[PDB]
C-alpha cells in the first residue's frame, strides 16, 4: 500500500499470458496476411476498371488493418495489459497514440463502407457505375477518406493527456494517459467516435451488402460456384464486423457513462478483464479481414497457400458461337441473343458486327457471348421493374421464382409476359398449381414445351427440380 496502490489492476498471471499469446498470434497472422495481400494486389494488374476499383479499395483496407496492428498493439501490450502505471510514453506519446489509433480505425470503417457502396453501384447501377468512377476518380476518393479519418481523429489530440493520479500530489509511478477534460466533452467525443466509426458504417454495410447478396443470388453449377461463395462472404462480412467491433464500443461507452458513485472494486476489476476480451476481438477484425475479403478470389486461394438466372438460361438458351436460327426461324447468337427478325443472313451479320464492334463474319468468342448476355438480362430486369403489371409480381417472389419470371421476359419480352394477366395474379397470390395449369394452356407452351415446362415446374415448386442438366 503506497501512493500508487490504487492504480494497480488485478488481472491474474494466467489471463495476462493467454491474452499475450493470443495477441501475438493475431499479430503474425494479421501482419503477414495484410502484407501478402498488398504484395498480391500489386502484381495482379487487372484490365477492367470495375475490378481494379475493388482492388484499390481492398488495398486501402489492408493497409489500415496493417497499421492498426503495428501502431496500436505494441504499446497496448506493454502499457494497457502488463504495466498499467505509470504511462511510459510522455504527454505527446499519449496524444499521438490515440490520434493514430482513431485515424487507422476511422480509415478502416470508412474503407469497408465505401467498398460496399462501390459494389452496390457496380451491380445495381452499372450505367452510372462506369460513368461515375474510374481509376483516377477512386484513387482520389481513397485519399478523401484518409484525410477524413485524419480530421475526425484531431479531437483526440486535445482530449487525451498525461496526468498524475497518485494519492500523493505527484509521484512518477502515478502518471497515466487518460482523457483529461470535462466528462461532458468526453461523453460527446466518445459518442461521436462511436457513431462515426460504428453506427454509420453499420447501416451502410448491413443494408447494402444484404441488397447486393439478394441481387447477386438472382443473377446467378461448377461454373458459378465462386459467385455463390461471394454471396456467403458478403453476409459473413457484416457478422464479422458486429461481433468484432460492438463490444469494443460498448466498453468505451461504459468507461464514460458509469459515474463515480457507481464504480466499485467489482466493476473496476470486471472492466480490465472485459478490456482483454474486447480488444482481442477488435484486433481479430484486422487479422481476418484479409483472409475473408479475399478467400473467394481465384488465385488468392493459392496465393496465401503459397506463403440463378445465368444457370437457368444457360440450360434453356444454350451457348452457340456461330449464328443459328431459333425456334421460330430467326437468326440468333450466343445465349439467346436475337440479332434480327429479317430473313437476310447478311442483315443478321451486319447487326452482329454492330453489336460488338468488330468484323466478326458471324462468329464470336465465349467472352463476347457473356458480354451480350449480361446486357440482355440487364434489359429484361429493367423491363420488369418499370412495368406496372410485372413489378408487383416480381417483388412478391422468392429468388428462384423471380429468376423464372426473368426467364419468360428474356424469351418473350416485357409486353409479351405482361399479357399473361391471370397467371400473373395467381403467382402474385401464391396459387402455384393454378398458375401452372393455366400457363400450360398457352401458345408459349406449344411453341417450346420442354423449356416452358421447366419454368412452369420452377414456378410451382420454387426448387431446382427441373434443372438437373445445369453445371
Amino acid at each position: 500500500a503506497g501512493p500508487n496502490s490504487d492504480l494497480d489492476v488485478n488481472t491474474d498471471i494466467y489471463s495476462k499470458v493467454l491474452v499475450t499469446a493470443i495477441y501475438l498470434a493475431l499479430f503474425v497472422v494479421g501482419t503477414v496476411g495484410n502484407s501478402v495481400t498488398l504484395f498480391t494486389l500489386a502484381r495482379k494488374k487487372s484490365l477492367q476498371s470495375l475490378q481494379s476499383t475493388v482492388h484499390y479499395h481492398l488495398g486501402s483496407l489492408a493497409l489500415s488493418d496493417l497499421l492498426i496492428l503495428l501502431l496500436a498493439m505494441p504499446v497496448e501490450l506493454y502499457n494497457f495489459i502488463w504495466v498499467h502505471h505509470p504511462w511510459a510514453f510522455g504527454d505527446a506519446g499519449c496524444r499521438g497514440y490515440y490520434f493514430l489509433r482513431d485515424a487507422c480505425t476511422y480509415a478502416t470503417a470508412l474503407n469497408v463502407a465505401s467498398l460496399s457502396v462501390a459494389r452496390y453501384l457496380a451491380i445495381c447501377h452499372p450505367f452510372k457505375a462506369k460513368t461515375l468512377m474510374s481509376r483516377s476518380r477512386t484513387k482520389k476518393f481513397i485519399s478523401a477518406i484518409w484525410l477524413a479519418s485524419a480530421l475526425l481523429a484531431i479531437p483526440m489530440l486535445f482530449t487525451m493527456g498525461l496526468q498524475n493520479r497518485s494519492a500523493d500530489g505527484t509521484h512518477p509511478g502515478g502518471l497515466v494517459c487518460t482523457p483529461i477534460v470535462d466528462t461532458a466533452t468526453v461523453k460527446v467525443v466518445i459518442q461521436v467516435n462511436t457513431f462515426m466509426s460504428f453506427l454509420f458504417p453499420m447501416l451502410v454495410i448491413s443494408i447494402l451488402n444484404t441488397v447486393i447478396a439478394n441481387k447477386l443470388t438472382v443473377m446467378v453449377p461448377g461454373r458459378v460456384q465462386a459467385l455463390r461463395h461471394g454471396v456467403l462472404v458478403l453476409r459473413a462480412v457484416v457478422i464479422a464486423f458486429v461481433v468484432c467491433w460492438l463490444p469494443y464500443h460498448v466498453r468505451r461507452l461504459m468507461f464514460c457513462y458509469i459515474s463515480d458513485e457507481q464504480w466499485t472494486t467489482f466493476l473496476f476489476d470486471f472492466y480490465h478483464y472485459f478490456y482483454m476480451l474486447t480488444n482481442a476481438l477488435f484486433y481479430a477484425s484486422s487479422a481476418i479481414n484479409p483472409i475473408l475479403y479475399n478467400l473467394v478470389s481465384a488465385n488468392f486461394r493459392q496465393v496465401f497457400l503459397s506463403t440463378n438466372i445465368f444457370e437457368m438460361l444457360r440450360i434453356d438458351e444454350g451457348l452457340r458461337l456461330k449464328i443459328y436460327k431459333d425456334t421460330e426461324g430467326y437468326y440468333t447468337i450466343g445465349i439467346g441473343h436475337l440479332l434480327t427478325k429479317s430473313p437476310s443472313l447478311n442483315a443478321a451479320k451486319s447487326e452482329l458486327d454492330k453489336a460488338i464492334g468488330r468484323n466478326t463474319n458471324g462468329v464470336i468468342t465465349k467472352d463476347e457471348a457473356e458480354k451480350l448476355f449480361n446486357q440482355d438480362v440487364d434489359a429484361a430486369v429493367r423491363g420488369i421493374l418499370r412495368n406496372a403489371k410485372l413489378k408487383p409480381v416480381y417483388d412478391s417472389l422468392d429468388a428462384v421464382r423471380r429468376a423464372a419470371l426473368i426467364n419468360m421476359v428474356f424469351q418473350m419480352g416485357e409486353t409479351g409476359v405482361a399479357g399473361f394477366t391471370n397467371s400473373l395474379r395467381m403467382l402474385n397470390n401464391k396459387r402455384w398449381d393454378e398458375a401452372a395449369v393455366n400457363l400450360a394452356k398457352s401458345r408459349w407452351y406449344n411453341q417450346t414445351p420442354n423449356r416452358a415446362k421447366r419454368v412452369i415446374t420452377t414456378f410451382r415448386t420454387g426448387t431446382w427440380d427441373a434443372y438437373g442438366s445445369g453445371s
Partner: peptide, 6 residues
C-alpha cells in the same frame, strides 16, 4: 476509484 485506461 474508476478505470483510467480508455
Amino acid at each position: 476509484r474508476r478505470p483510467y485506461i480508455l
